[PDB]
Amino acid sequence: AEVVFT
Amino acid sequence: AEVVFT
Amino acid sequence: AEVVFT
Amino acid sequence: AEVVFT
Amino acid sequence: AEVVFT
Amino acid sequence: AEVVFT
Amino acid sequence: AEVVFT
Amino acid sequence: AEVVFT
């Protein structure tokens, strides 16, 4: 699982 | 920007 | 921004 | 910026 | 910013 | 598990 | 899994 | 799975 908030 | 890989 | 998962 | 790898 | 996981 | 807040 | 950003 | 954006 990968979460990237930018 | 939101990326969610599950 | 928000993510919730299960 | 938030990165969460699980 | 916040993450909670289990 | 990797959390990176920047 | 990998993320790169700028 | 992959995403690239600019």
Side-chain angles (χ1 to χ4, degrees):
Chain A
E2 297 72 47
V3 177
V4 178
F5 283 5
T6 53
Chain B
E2 297 72 47
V3 177
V4 178
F5 283 5
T6 53
Chain C
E2 176 176 321
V3 55
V4 181
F5 66 88
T6 177
Chain D
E2 297 72 47
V3 177
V4 178
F5 283 5
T6 53
Chain E
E2 176 176 321
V3 55
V4 181
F5 66 88
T6 177
Chain F
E2 297 72 47
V3 177
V4 178
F5 283 5
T6 53
Chain G
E2 176 176 321
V3 55
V4 181
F5 66 88
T6 177
Chain H
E2 176 176 321
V3 55
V4 181
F5 66 88
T6 177

Coordinates of all heavy atoms in Angstrom, one line a residue:
Chain A
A1 N 0.8 -1.2 0.0 CA 0.0 0.0 0.0 C 0.9 1.3 0.0 O 1.8 1.4 0.8 CB -0.9 0.0 1.2
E2 N 0.6 2.2 -0.9 CA 1.3 3.4 -1.1 C 0.4 4.6 -1.1 O -0.6 4.7 -1.9 CB 2.1 3.4 -2.4 CG 3.2 2.3 -2.4 CD 2.6 0.9 -2.6 OE1 1.8 0.8 -3.5 OE2 3.0 0.0 -1.9
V3 N 0.6 5.5 -0.2 CA -0.1 6.8 -0.1 C 0.9 7.9 -0.3 O 1.9 8.0 0.5 CB -0.8 7.0 1.2 CG1 -1.5 8.3 1.3 CG2 -1.9 5.8 1.5
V4 N 0.7 8.8 -1.2 CA 1.5 9.9 -1.4 C 0.6 11.2 -1.6 O -0.2 11.3 -2.5 CB 2.4 9.8 -2.7 CG1 3.3 11.0 -2.9 CG2 3.3 8.5 -2.6
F5 N 0.8 12.1 -0.6 CA 0.0 13.3 -0.6 C 1.0 14.5 -0.9 O 2.0 14.7 -0.1 CB -0.7 13.6 0.7 CG -2.0 12.8 0.9 CD1 -2.4 11.8 -0.1 CD2 -2.8 13.0 2.0 CE1 -3.6 11.1 0.0 CE2 -4.0 12.3 2.1 CZ -4.4 11.3 1.1
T6 N 0.9 15.2 -2.0 CA 1.8 16.3 -2.3 C 1.0 17.4 -2.9 O -0.2 17.4 -2.9 CB 2.9 15.9 -3.4 OG1 2.2 15.3 -4.5 CG2 3.8 14.8 -2.8
Chain B
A1 N -2.4 17.0 -4.5 CA -2.3 15.8 -5.3 C -2.3 14.6 -4.3 O -1.6 14.5 -3.3 CB -1.0 15.8 -6.1
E2 N -3.1 13.6 -4.7 CA -3.3 12.4 -3.9 C -3.1 11.1 -4.7 O -3.8 11.0 -5.7 CB -4.6 12.3 -3.1 CG -4.9 13.5 -2.1 CD -5.1 14.8 -2.8 OE1 -5.9 14.9 -3.8 OE2 -4.4 15.8 -2.4
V3 N -2.2 10.3 -4.3 CA -2.0 9.0 -4.9 C -2.2 7.9 -3.9 O -1.6 8.0 -2.8 CB -0.6 8.9 -5.6 CG1 -0.4 7.5 -6.2 CG2 -0.4 9.9 -6.6
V4 N -3.1 7.0 -4.2 CA -3.3 5.9 -3.3 C -3.3 4.6 -4.1 O -4.1 4.4 -4.9 CB -4.6 6.0 -2.5 CG1 -4.9 4.8 -1.6 CG2 -4.7 7.3 -1.6
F5 N -2.3 3.7 -3.8 CA -2.2 2.4 -4.4 C -2.4 1.4 -3.4 O -1.7 1.2 -2.4 CB -0.8 2.3 -5.0 CG -0.5 3.0 -6.4 CD1 -1.5 3.8 -6.9 CD2 0.6 2.8 -7.1 CE1 -1.3 4.5 -8.1 CE2 0.8 3.4 -8.3 CZ -0.1 4.3 -8.8
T6 N -3.5 0.6 -3.6 CA -3.8 -0.5 -2.6 C -4.2 -1.7 -3.4 O -4.1 -1.8 -4.6 CB -5.0 -0.1 -1.7 OG1 -6.1 0.4 -2.5 CG2 -4.6 1.0 -0.8
Chain C
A1 N -7.1 16.9 2.2 CA -7.1 15.6 1.6 C -7.0 14.5 2.6 O -6.4 14.6 3.6 CB -5.9 15.5 0.6
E2 N -7.7 13.4 2.3 CA -7.8 12.3 3.2 C -8.0 11.0 2.5 O -8.6 10.9 1.5 CB -8.9 12.5 4.2 CG -9.2 11.4 5.2 CD -10.3 11.9 6.2 OE1 -10.3 13.0 6.6 OE2 -11.2 11.0 6.5
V3 N -7.4 9.9 3.0 CA -7.7 8.5 2.6 C -7.9 7.7 3.8 O -7.3 7.8 4.9 CB -6.5 7.9 1.7 CG1 -5.2 8.0 2.5 CG2 -6.9 6.5 1.3
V4 N -8.9 6.8 3.8 CA -9.1 5.8 4.8 C -9.3 4.5 4.0 O -10.1 4.5 3.0 CB -10.4 6.0 5.7 CG1 -10.5 4.9 6.7 CG2 -10.3 7.4 6.3
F5 N -8.6 3.4 4.4 CA -8.9 2.1 3.8 C -8.7 1.0 4.8 O -8.0 1.1 5.8 CB -8.0 1.9 2.5 CG -6.5 1.9 2.8 CD1 -5.9 0.6 3.0 CD2 -5.7 3.0 2.6 CE1 -4.6 0.6 3.2 CE2 -4.4 2.9 2.8 CZ -3.8 1.7 3.1
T6 N -9.3 -0.1 4.4 CA -9.1 -1.4 5.2 C -9.2 -2.5 4.2 O -10.0 -2.5 3.3 CB -10.2 -1.5 6.3 OG1 -10.0 -2.8 6.9 CG2 -11.6 -1.4 5.7
Chain D
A1 N 4.0 17.4 2.5 CA 4.1 16.2 1.8 C 4.1 15.0 2.7 O 4.8 14.9 3.7 CB 5.4 16.2 0.9
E2 N 3.3 14.0 2.4 CA 3.1 12.8 3.2 C 3.3 11.5 2.3 O 2.6 11.4 1.3 CB 1.8 12.8 3.9 CG 1.6 13.9 4.9 CD 1.3 15.2 4.2 OE1 0.5 15.3 3.3 OE2 2.0 16.2 4.6
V3 N 4.2 10.7 2.7 CA 4.4 9.4 2.1 C 4.2 8.3 3.1 O 4.9 8.4 4.2 CB 5.8 9.3 1.5 CG1 6.0 7.9 0.9 CG2 6.1 10.3 0.4
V4 N 3.3 7.4 2.9 CA 3.1 6.3 3.8 C 3.1 5.0 3.0 O 2.3 4.8 2.1 CB 1.8 6.4 4.6 CG1 1.6 5.2 5.5 CG2 1.8 7.7 5.4
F5 N 4.1 4.1 3.2 CA 4.3 2.8 2.6 C 4.0 1.8 3.6 O 4.7 1.7 4.6 CB 5.7 2.7 2.0 CG 5.9 3.4 0.7 CD1 4.9 4.2 0.1 CD2 7.1 3.2 0.0 CE1 5.1 4.9 -1.1 CE2 7.3 3.9 -1.2 CZ 6.3 4.7 -1.8
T6 N 2.9 1.0 3.4 CA 2.6 -0.1 4.4 C 2.2 -1.3 3.6 O 2.3 -1.3 2.4 CB 1.4 0.3 5.3 OG1 0.3 0.8 4.5 CG2 1.8 1.4 6.2
Chain E
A1 N -0.7 17.3 9.3 CA -0.7 16.0 8.6 C -0.6 14.9 9.6 O 0.0 15.0 10.7 CB 0.5 15.9 7.6
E2 N -1.2 13.8 9.3 CA -1.3 12.7 10.2 C -1.6 11.4 9.5 O -2.2 11.3 8.5 CB -2.5 13.0 11.2 CG -2.8 11.8 12.2 CD -3.9 12.3 13.2 OE1 -3.9 13.4 13.6 OE2 -4.8 11.4 13.5
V3 N -1.0 10.3 10.1 CA -1.3 8.9 9.6 C -1.5 8.1 10.9 O -0.8 8.2 11.9 CB -0.1 8.3 8.8 CG1 1.2 8.4 9.5 CG2 -0.5 6.9 8.4
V4 N -2.5 7.2 10.8 CA -2.7 6.2 11.8 C -2.9 4.9 11.0 O -3.6 4.9 10.1 CB -3.9 6.4 12.7 CG1 -4.1 5.3 13.8 CG2 -3.9 7.8 13.4
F5 N -2.2 3.8 11.5 CA -2.5 2.6 10.8 C -2.2 1.4 11.8 O -1.6 1.5 12.9 CB -1.6 2.4 9.6 CG -0.1 2.3 9.8 CD1 0.5 1.1 10.1 CD2 0.7 3.4 9.7 CE1 1.9 1.0 10.3 CE2 2.1 3.3 9.8 CZ 2.7 2.1 10.1
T6 N -2.8 0.3 11.5 CA -2.7 -1.0 12.2 C -2.8 -2.1 11.3 O -3.6 -2.1 10.3 CB -3.7 -1.1 13.3 OG1 -3.6 -2.4 14.0 CG2 -5.2 -1.0 12.8
Chain F
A1 N 7.3 -0.8 7.0 CA 6.4 0.4 7.0 C 7.3 1.7 7.0 O 8.2 1.8 7.8 CB 5.5 0.4 8.2
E2 N 7.0 2.6 6.1 CA 7.7 3.8 6.0 C 6.8 5.0 6.0 O 5.8 5.1 5.2 CB 8.6 3.8 4.7 CG 9.6 2.7 4.6 CD 9.1 1.4 4.4 OE1 8.2 1.2 3.5 OE2 9.4 0.4 5.2
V3 N 7.1 5.9 6.9 CA 6.3 7.2 6.9 C 7.3 8.3 6.8 O 8.3 8.4 7.5 CB 5.6 7.4 8.3 CG1 4.9 8.7 8.3 CG2 4.5 6.2 8.5
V4 N 7.1 9.2 5.8 CA 8.0 10.3 5.6 C 7.1 11.6 5.4 O 6.3 11.7 4.5 CB 8.9 10.2 4.3 CG1 9.7 11.4 4.1 CG2 9.8 8.9 4.5
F5 N 7.2 12.5 6.4 CA 6.5 13.7 6.4 C 7.5 14.9 6.2 O 8.4 15.1 7.0 CB 5.7 14.0 7.7 CG 4.5 13.2 7.9 CD1 4.1 12.3 6.9 CD2 3.6 13.4 9.0 CE1 2.9 11.5 7.1 CE2 2.4 12.7 9.1 CZ 2.1 11.8 8.2
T6 N 7.3 15.6 5.0 CA 8.2 16.7 4.7 C 7.4 17.8 4.2 O 6.2 17.8 4.2 CB 9.3 16.3 3.7 OG1 8.6 15.7 2.5 CG2 10.2 15.2 4.2
Chain G
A1 N 8.0 -0.9 -4.0 CA 7.2 0.3 -4.2 C 8.2 1.5 -4.1 O 9.2 1.5 -3.3 CB 6.2 0.4 -3.1
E2 N 7.9 2.5 -4.8 CA 8.7 3.7 -4.9 C 8.0 4.9 -5.3 O 7.0 4.9 -6.0 CB 9.8 3.4 -6.0 CG 10.8 4.6 -6.2 CD 11.9 4.1 -7.2 OE1 12.4 3.0 -7.1 OE2 12.2 5.0 -8.1
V3 N 8.4 6.1 -4.7 CA 7.9 7.4 -5.1 C 9.1 8.3 -5.3 O 10.1 8.3 -4.5 CB 6.9 8.0 -4.1 CG1 7.5 8.1 -2.7 CG2 6.4 9.4 -4.6
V4 N 9.1 9.1 -6.4 CA 10.0 10.2 -6.5 C 9.2 11.4 -6.9 O 8.3 11.3 -7.7 CB 11.1 9.9 -7.7 CG1 12.0 11.1 -7.8 CG2 11.8 8.6 -7.5
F5 N 9.5 12.5 -6.2 CA 8.8 13.8 -6.6 C 9.7 15.0 -6.4 O 10.7 14.9 -5.6 CB 7.5 13.9 -5.9 CG 7.6 14.1 -4.4 CD1 7.7 15.4 -3.8 CD2 7.4 13.0 -3.5 CE1 7.8 15.6 -2.5 CE2 7.5 13.2 -2.1 CZ 7.6 14.5 -1.6
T6 N 9.4 16.0 -7.1 CA 10.0 17.3 -6.9 C 9.0 18.4 -7.2 O 8.2 18.3 -8.1 CB 11.2 17.5 -7.9 OG1 11.8 18.8 -7.8 CG2 10.8 17.3 -9.4
Chain H
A1 N 1.5 -1.4 -11.1 CA 0.8 -0.1 -11.2 C 1.7 1.1 -11.1 O 2.7 1.0 -10.4 CB -0.3 0.0 -10.1
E2 N 1.4 2.1 -11.8 CA 2.3 3.3 -11.9 C 1.5 4.5 -12.3 O 0.6 4.5 -13.0 CB 3.4 3.0 -13.0 CG 4.4 4.2 -13.3 CD 5.5 3.7 -14.2 OE1 6.0 2.6 -14.1 OE2 5.8 4.5 -15.1
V3 N 2.0 5.7 -11.7 CA 1.5 7.0 -12.2 C 2.7 7.9 -12.3 O 3.6 7.9 -11.6 CB 0.5 7.6 -11.1 CG1 1.1 7.6 -9.7 CG2 0.0 9.0 -11.6
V4 N 2.6 8.7 -13.4 CA 3.6 9.8 -13.6 C 2.8 11.0 -13.9 O 1.9 10.9 -14.7 CB 4.6 9.5 -14.7 CG1 5.6 10.7 -14.8 CG2 5.4 8.2 -14.5
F5 N 3.1 12.1 -13.2 CA 2.4 13.4 -13.6 C 3.3 14.6 -13.4 O 4.3 14.5 -12.7 CB 1.1 13.5 -12.9 CG 1.1 13.7 -11.4 CD1 1.3 15.0 -10.9 CD2 1.0 12.6 -10.5 CE1 1.4 15.2 -9.5 CE2 1.0 12.8 -9.2 CZ 1.2 14.1 -8.6
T6 N 2.9 15.6 -14.1 CA 3.6 16.9 -14.0 C 2.6 18.0 -14.2 O 1.7 17.9 -15.1 CB 4.8 17.1 -14.9 OG1 5.4 18.4 -14.8 CG2 4.4 16.9 -16.4

